[PDB]
Motif scaffolding. Structure first.
Motif, PDB file in Angstrom:
ATOM      1  N   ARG A 152       0.807  -1.212   0.000  1.00  0.00           N
ATOM      2  CA  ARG A 152       0.000   0.000   0.000  1.00  0.00           C
ATOM      3  C   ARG A 152       0.845   1.268   0.000  1.00  0.00           C
ATOM      4  O   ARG A 152       0.411   2.297  -0.554  1.00  0.00           O
ATOM      5  N   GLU A 153       2.037   1.235   0.548  1.00  0.00           N
ATOM      6  CA  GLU A 153       2.856   2.377   0.366  1.00  0.00           C
ATOM      7  C   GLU A 153       3.349   2.466  -1.007  1.00  0.00           C
ATOM      8  O   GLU A 153       3.282   3.516  -1.637  1.00  0.00           O
ATOM      9  N   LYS A 154       3.836   1.359  -1.507  1.00  0.00           N
ATOM     10  CA  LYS A 154       4.380   1.318  -2.845  1.00  0.00           C
ATOM     11  C   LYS A 154       3.278   1.625  -3.852  1.00  0.00           C
ATOM     12  O   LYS A 154       3.546   2.175  -4.876  1.00  0.00           O
ATOM     13  N   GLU A 155       2.054   1.218  -3.586  1.00  0.00           N
ATOM     14  CA  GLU A 155       0.949   1.520  -4.447  1.00  0.00           C
ATOM     15  C   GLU A 155       0.751   2.988  -4.422  1.00  0.00           C
ATOM     16  O   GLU A 155       0.290   3.566  -5.423  1.00  0.00           O
ATOM     17  N   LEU A 156       1.098   3.631  -3.325  1.00  0.00           N
ATOM     18  CA  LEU A 156       0.985   5.062  -3.273  1.00  0.00           C
ATOM     19  C   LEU A 156       2.243   5.725  -3.703  1.00  0.00           C
ATOM     20  O   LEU A 156       2.224   6.722  -4.406  1.00  0.00           O
ATOM     21  N   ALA A 157       3.360   5.174  -3.305  1.00  0.00           N
ATOM     22  CA  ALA A 157       4.587   5.899  -3.414  1.00  0.00           C
ATOM     23  C   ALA A 157       4.971   6.095  -4.796  1.00  0.00           C
ATOM     24  O   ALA A 157       5.697   7.016  -5.070  1.00  0.00           O
ATOM     25  N   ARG A 158       4.571   5.189  -5.680  1.00  0.00           N
ATOM     26  CA  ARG A 158       4.769   5.418  -7.080  1.00  0.00           C
ATOM     27  C   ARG A 158       3.708   6.337  -7.579  1.00  0.00           C
ATOM     28  O   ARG A 158       3.976   7.181  -8.441  1.00  0.00           O
ATOM     29  N   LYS A 159       2.503   6.197  -7.057  1.00  0.00           N
ATOM     30  CA  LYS A 159       1.391   6.932  -7.609  1.00  0.00           C
ATOM     31  C   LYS A 159       1.510   8.435  -7.405  1.00  0.00           C
ATOM     32  O   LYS A 159       1.090   9.189  -8.256  1.00  0.00           O
ATOM     33  N   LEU A 160       2.120   8.885  -6.324  1.00  0.00           N
ATOM     34  CA  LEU A 160       2.435  10.297  -6.203  1.00  0.00           C
ATOM     35  C   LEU A 160       3.502  10.723  -7.170  1.00  0.00           C
ATOM     36  O   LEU A 160       3.506  11.886  -7.538  1.00  0.00           O
ATOM     37  N   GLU A 161       4.410   9.836  -7.551  1.00  0.00           N
ATOM     38  CA  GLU A 161       5.521  10.223  -8.344  1.00  0.00           C
ATOM     39  C   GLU A 161       5.367   9.919  -9.792  1.00  0.00           C
ATOM     40  O   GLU A 161       6.305  10.110 -10.595  1.00  0.00           O
ATOM     41  N   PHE A 162       4.175   9.483 -10.169  1.00  0.00           N
ATOM     42  CA  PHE A 162       3.865   9.294 -11.571  1.00  0.00           C
ATOM     43  C   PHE A 162       2.525   9.885 -11.904  1.00  0.00           C
ATOM     44  O   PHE A 162       2.462  10.994 -12.476  1.00  0.00           O
ATOM     45  N   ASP A 163       1.457   9.197 -11.554  1.00  0.00           N
ATOM     46  CA  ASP A 163       0.153   9.782 -11.798  1.00  0.00           C
ATOM     47  C   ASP A 163       0.029  11.039 -10.957  1.00  0.00           C
ATOM     48  O   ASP A 163      -0.617  11.984 -11.328  1.00  0.00           O
ATOM     49  N   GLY A 164       0.632  11.008  -9.788  1.00  0.00           N
ATOM     50  CA  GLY A 164       0.735  12.162  -8.940  1.00  0.00           C
ATOM     51  C   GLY A 164      -0.592  12.684  -8.505  1.00  0.00           C
ATOM     52  O   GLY A 164      -0.758  13.883  -8.347  1.00  0.00           O
ATOM     53  N   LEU A 165      -1.544  11.802  -8.291  1.00  0.00           N
ATOM     54  CA  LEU A 165      -2.909  12.199  -8.265  1.00  0.00           C
ATOM     55  C   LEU A 165      -3.226  13.203  -7.187  1.00  0.00           C
ATOM     56  O   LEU A 165      -4.008  14.121  -7.417  1.00  0.00           O
ATOM     57  N   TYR A 166      -2.602  13.074  -6.028  1.00  0.00           N
ATOM     58  CA  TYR A 166      -2.891  14.034  -4.956  1.00  0.00           C
ATOM     59  C   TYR A 166      -2.427  15.431  -5.339  1.00  0.00           C
ATOM     60  O   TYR A 166      -2.970  16.435  -4.935  1.00  0.00           O
ATOM     61  N   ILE A 167      -1.391  15.465  -6.142  1.00  0.00           N
ATOM     62  CA  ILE A 167      -0.912  16.677  -6.722  1.00  0.00           C
ATOM     63  C   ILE A 167      -1.834  17.144  -7.831  1.00  0.00           C
ATOM     64  O   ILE A 167      -1.885  18.308  -8.134  1.00  0.00           O
ATOM     65  N   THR A 168      -2.612  16.251  -8.404  1.00  0.00           N
ATOM     66  CA  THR A 168      -3.505  16.581  -9.526  1.00  0.00           C
ATOM     67  C   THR A 168      -4.971  16.172  -9.281  1.00  0.00           C
ATOM     68  O   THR A 168      -5.854  17.029  -9.108  1.00  0.00           O
TER      69      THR A 168
END
Lengths: 70, 69
Positions: free
Chosen positions: A1-17
């Protein structure tokens, strides 16, 4: 779940977007933890959170992103 | 304000001479301030559609010609 997130902030970056949306709050709990200083405790990459601001935040308020992180 | 837009453009990164060109190409409306919606006309999009179509048409028809790439 971190890795599912940790990449997701740094690629899809969804919380940023994006945001996850009303369903799958399991992904929306994440809004909480990401603020935590100690967040990437298990992915063996503490500097992810630093790495993310190098990306994304240059596009807008690099420390406007910091309030989301620290 | 045009200077505030010049500061906004430092980050959110278009090249700086081009930034000054945006300032000039804007309107310089009301002493020193600028609308966003008026500053969206260029309509112009069809050309660029056809350009990208053209370049894709090349990258498909004429691959690995590195200058083109």
């Amino acid at each position: 779940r971190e890795k599912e997130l940790a990449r997701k902030l740094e690629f899809d970056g969804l919380y940023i977007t994006e945001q996850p949306g009303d369903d799958d709050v399991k992904g929306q709990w994440d809004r909480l933890v990401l603020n935590t200083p100690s967040f990437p405790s298990n992915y063996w990459d503490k500097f992810v959170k630093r790495k993310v601001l190098d990306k994304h935040g240059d596009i807008f308020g690099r420390e406007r992103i910091a309030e989301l992180l620290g | 304000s045009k200077k505030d837009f010049q500061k906004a453009m430092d980050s959110q990164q278009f090249t700086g001479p081009e930034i000054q060109f945006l300032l000039s190409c804007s309107e310089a409306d009301e002493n020193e301030m600028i609308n966003f919606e008026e500053f969206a006309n260029r309509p112009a999009r069809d050309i660029g559609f056809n350009v990208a179509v053209l370049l894709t048409n090349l990258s498909e028809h004429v691959p690995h010609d590195p200058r083109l790439r």
